Paper text:
The lead inhibitory peptide, PADI4_3, binds the active form of PADI4 and inhibits activity both in vitro and in cells, with higher potency and isozyme selectivity than previous compounds. We determined the structure of PADI4_3-bound PADI4 by cryoEM to an overall resolution of 3.1 Å. Additionally, well-defined density for the whole cyclic peptide was observed in both monomers, allowing us to assign all residues unambiguously. Unusually for peptides derived from RaPID selections, PADI4_3 itself does not adopt any secondary structure elements and relatively few intramolecular hydrogen bonds are observed within PADI4_348. The structure confirmed that PADI4_3 is a substrate-competitive inhibitor that binds within the active site of PADI4. Although PADI4_3 occupies the substrate binding site, rather than directly mimicking substrate binding by directing an arginine towards the active site, a histidine residue, H4, occupies this position. 760 Å2 of surface area is buried (per monomer) and, in line with its nanomolar binding affinity, there are many specific intermolecular interactions between PADI4 and PADI4_3 across this interface. This includes a bifurcated hydrogen bond between PADI4 R374 and the carbonyls of the PADI4_3 D3 backbone and the N-terminal acetyl group. Hydrogen bonds between the side chains of PADI4_3 R2 and PADI4 D344, PADI4_3 D3 and PADI4 H640, PADI4_3 H4 and PADI4 D350, and PADI4_3 H5 and PADI4 S468 are also observed. In line with the selectivity observed in COLDER assays, many of these residues are not conserved in other PADI isozymes or mouse PADI4. This is most pronounced for H640, which is not conserved in PADI1, PADI2 or mPADI4, and D344, which is not conserved in any of the other human PADIs.
Residue numbers in the entry:
A (entry chain B), C (entry chain A): 4 to 53, 66 to 97, 103 to 127, 137 to 217, 224 to 663
B (entry chain D), D (entry chain C): 0 to 12
Write the structure that this text describes.
């Protein structure tokens, strides 16, 4: 929208940009005695009146052109007042600032959904240069050609007459609030024009037809202090008079949204499995290698020289991805916990096409609920009409704040909440000694109903199983008989334990509260949940610990499951717990493999899933098609 | 904690 | 949603809360050989099955009760499996946490609009105690009865059997993120239970029927780090076993939204006018007193002993209001600028039923665009369907960031943006020497069309007026003839000034850009805008200053206007500029009064509006009925 | 600026 005023005392020269509506005001300086006007336009100019017309402010005149002029003042417009004459010389230019607003792959607001518009920006968090140890966005230069594949392309197209920019100028700018989270390189090679230091640049454009290319990169993920929207503006200013300051004549803008960080659940196909090689960790590693080979995925083993005697691969990092209509790449989120494996996600994970991100106090005080074994994500779900095609994030907390309670760090909580594509859900997991939601819940695939099954630990189921075993004449079977150097317990003495029964009742109450939370928050039914037998015992600080290896704390690779070996009672040559788990899971098409981790992980209060990390294939669904 | 799963613990760590 | 499991081996005692759905799981521990079940319920219990029924997980049982029991285990339910028998003893309690969710005045989500739900919290920013100099929310005690009128009431109603809380407990809590922006007092007198120090409290409730009253207050306005939502939770925990930890059995929550800070435009009726009494400021004060008396409003004059030779009342503070279904009260926003009047908004404005708020760096570096003469608000407007029943906020900025550019502080910008009820609009006002949007735009009431008129300065109009004056034989009239000790300028020598013409052309270009911005952002037409004659001149740093007193920088009190006296040329015994302004404004029903401010304010680059502040009546429209 | 409307100015303040 531009207003042009014509006076009969002197003609005026105005500049119009193709595609913009130009309103022509004629009553501002019309003769007082005049009452009607007529318009004589060159054939290259289209006039719309909204053959004389009354001279009143109600009527409006709008001007349009179809071709950019080759000379200044090419097209004239004559206003005849009733007869005085007024002239308007006018030249047309085309100024376009094009991005991938259609989210299709090929080149002033951002809207969600499949019928929206707006471009997507990728954080340059990977390391495409092999002669550095920092991320690609920590410097204001592009050192590789491949580094241009993580940057969004923006094209400035100018069709202007010859010798047009001797009196006009073009400025590319961004707001000072968003200037520290974006960088723009002009392709000539790549020289920085906009960034955390320069919020404006004076573009140099030649007359005629010209196309310029800019590569845009982001330097920060969306957070509580960053909604995620960046607006880049182009301004055409008049510089006809040297003494007079430049006056803005045209302005166009392009809006980008920074792609959020997205998790992947256990139902996605696996691609790579990580593990640690600590002392005496040989049979576990052999089982993991066999399972990975069966599941057709590679393995990455960290040598003990880099473990620093740390075997908890799951807690240190969490792998997700970031995608955009031109490029998708995984990202590793580094936990604020720094124990032994503090250098692995920064030295042996982040690299070419593998980004890195971290939050929280690196050297400050944190709790045990900040470990990323407490962070999980559910399969896509429909909750009372609302759709979550990427799932929902689940992490543990307490019932109410108090002096002894623990919580995940607020920085991590606001980070996960700022990633809006998956709304986080708080679960009650502080009752556990470690406080990890992976110790009592899991997700497995299934080819029926919603497409998945939620497995929850259930002391009741184990007690019922032992009751049936004792009823069938097997009451002297020895739990922990497969393992040695430990006390084996008969079924009757484990059934007649009042303290154990009370501890398991309290644990069952907590797990039932968690299940009631999960059903409401994920829209599940009683047919979507499977109860895995388990036994807990209260310990120091009256917090629960697994009585025997946690069978729900297992590794899931497609249809292959690596389950911790419970070493339960042996009936008819087979372990009753293993037989029950096989009967519960195999009808879903899954194959159950039991891995021994007693003296290596269970003794250290960990299981197969606690010591492994898996990279999963990104969702086929495009996050920008989600409507949060 | 040092070699234990618990981030901090009066007994195991 | 609560799940109760019944086993035939032993009856179970469960506690149900009225108004909550209780699902009864019977297949979890049903006999293996059983195939059908029957239900026998006490007449006080209503069962819903979703006369035997198949024993499958598909079928569900739901329990409801209509009256809270007077004894524990009053109602029994019998499950007959096909026949084994299982029993369920059950008692009913009523736990209600009621607030003003209907926003009507009388006592788990918050939704905007006239068909929404959710309570509103007021910030206790006033000073109801006369023996203190701080705000009411800076201490954890209530010292006055009237102080309870700014606090929201929340009622906890418990109907439980006698001796019910010897085994159960009630906890009132809030999240640690929102705990520092809320405080709760239990009415007995008022003792604090929740606040920035204690995030949980152990309520003491007697058996039978009991009602408890809580008064909630907020300590912080919505900002960029505070969406404005506070959730208060009540938890019922079981404490049957001393050694076992308490287990959560019930949870209810109430969501409050903090009322935002709302501006008032010039179309609202006035109530109080502020002014300063500096030396030689006598005739201006007399005119202001006469105008206030005519408009039927009071005056508040700051003595020179408190001015510290500062006469710019408008820039120091801005007055808005906060309202809630029970209480409305004005609030004063203190500008980061602290020049002379830095103590007035804190010592002579804030008091009983008058809150105070401030932002920005108190002792840091700021610019001249932070003065609250640069902050204004428009009347309610409809923009392309979208409704703004409270108006939109307008403040000045620059075209693009650069080294010499100025801006309003980011803290103030995010504060105004966090107050969502009026979306701020950025206008180009950095071209002015002072940089205040009040120097070129104003709003006046009118009883037709949208109900208001936007007045914009127009050098073109003044030049046209002078041209007609010279054409009518009056070309020797002396501008500035009414005033003395200054150079009087003839009309011909002011028309033949090429430098002045170029400066006015540049100023007109800037004002036209601002008008094109305003029309799009407020949905106005050419009939909603009136052009006031004006003349500008470029000065040091090539920035515009008013050539003669800014006639658009006036005081508006209903239908009474106090306009700066332009001292223009005198034709036929009347000033031409005054006559033109009267002809433009009087048909709207307004009355124009001209106030002399040449040697007192204009010499110091200020006008009548720059030295006055007005308190306006709050909007009748309820902000919670707005849908942003 | 001291007594002028301008917050800062090389000449008036
Ligand atoms: Ca780089
Ligand atoms: Ca890169
Ligand atoms: Ca780390
Ligand atoms: Ca790359
Ligand atoms: Ca995880
Ligand atoms: Ca108080
Ligand atoms: Ca108060
Ligand atoms: Ca102040
Ligand atoms: Ca009060
Ligand atoms: Ca103001």
């Amino acid at each position: 929208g531009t207003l042009i005023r014509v006076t009969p005392e002197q003609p005026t020269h105005a500049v119009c940009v193709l595609g913009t509506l130009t309103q022509l005001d004629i009553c501002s300086s019309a003769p007082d005695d005049c009452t009607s006007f007529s318009i004589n336009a060159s054939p290259g100019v289209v006039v719309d009146i909204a053959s004389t017309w009354p001279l009143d402010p109600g009527v409006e005149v709008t001007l349009t052109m179809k071709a950019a002029s080759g000379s200044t003042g090419d097209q004239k417009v004559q206003i005849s007042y009733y007869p005085v004459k007024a002239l308007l010389y006018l030249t047309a230019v085309e100024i376009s600032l094009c991005a991938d607003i259609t989210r299709t792959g090929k080149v002033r607001t951002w809207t969600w959904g499949p019928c929206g518009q707006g471009a997507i920006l990728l954080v340059n968090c990977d390391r495409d240069n092999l002669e550095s140890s920092a991320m690609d966005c920590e410097d204001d230069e592009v050192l590789d050609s491949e580094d241009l594949q993580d940057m969004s392309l923006m094209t400035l197209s100018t069709k202007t007459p010859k010798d047009f920019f001797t009196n006009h100028t073009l400025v590319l700018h961004v707001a000072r609030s968003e200037m520290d989270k974006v960088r723009v390189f002009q392709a000539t090679k790549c020289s920085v024009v906009l960034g955390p230091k320069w919020p404006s640049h004076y573009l140099m454009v030649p007359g005629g037809k010209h196309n310029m290319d800019f590569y845009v990169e982001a330097l920060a993920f969306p957070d509580t202090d960053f909604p995620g929207l960046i607006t880049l503006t182009i301004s055409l200013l008049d510089t006809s008079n040297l003494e007079l300051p430049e006056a803005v004549v045209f302005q166009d803008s392009v809006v980008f949204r920074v792609a959020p960080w997205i998790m992947t659940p256990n139902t996605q196909p696996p691609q790579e499995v990580y593990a640690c090689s600590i002392f005496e960790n040989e049979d576990f590693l052999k089982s993991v290698t066999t399972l990975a080979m069966k599941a057709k995925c590679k393995l990455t083993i960290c040598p003990e020289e880099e473990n620093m005697d740390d075997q908890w691969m799951q807690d240190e990092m969490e792998i997700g991805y970031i995608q955009a209509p031109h490029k998708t790449l995984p990202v590793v989120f580094d936990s604020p916990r720094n124990r032994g494996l503090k250098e692995f996600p920064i030295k042996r994970v982040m690299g070419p096409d593998f980004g890195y991100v971290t939050r929280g106090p690196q050297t400050g005080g944190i709790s045990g609920l900040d470990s990323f074994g407490n962070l999980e994500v559910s399969p896509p779900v429909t909750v009372r009409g609302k759709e979550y095609p990427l799932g929902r994030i689940l992490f543990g907390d307490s019932c109410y704040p108090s002096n002894d309670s623990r919580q995940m760090h607020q920085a991590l909580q606001d980070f996960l909440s700022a990633q809006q594509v998956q709304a986080p859900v708080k679960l009650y997991s502080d009752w556990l000694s470690v406080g990890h939601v992976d110790e009592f819940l899991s997700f497995v695939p299934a080819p029926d109903r919603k497409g998945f099954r939620l497995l929850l630990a259930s002391p009741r189921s184990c007690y019922k199983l032992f009751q049936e075993q004792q009823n069938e004449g097997h009451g002297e079977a020895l739990l922990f008989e497969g393992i040695k150097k430990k006390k084996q317990q008969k079924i009757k003495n484990i059934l007649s334990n009042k303290t154990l029964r009370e501890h398991n009742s309290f644990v069952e109450r907590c797990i039932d509260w968690n299940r009631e939370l999960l059903k409401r928050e994920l829209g599940l039914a009683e047919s979507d949940i499977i109860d895995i037998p388990q036994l807990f015992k209260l310990k120091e600080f009256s917090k629960a610990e697994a009585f025997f290896p946690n069978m729900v704390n297992m590794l899931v690779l497609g249809k292959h499951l690596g389950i911790p070996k419970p070493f339960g009672p042996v009936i008819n040559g087979r372990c009753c717990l293993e037989e029950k788990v096989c009967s519960l899971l195999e009808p879903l098409g899954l194959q159950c493999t039991f891995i021994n981790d007693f003296f290596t992980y269970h003794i250290r209060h960990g299981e197969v899933h606690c010591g492994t990390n898996v990279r999963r294939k990104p969702f086929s669904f495009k996050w920008w098609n989600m409507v949060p | 904690x040092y070699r234990d799963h618990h981030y901090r613990h009066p007994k195991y760590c």
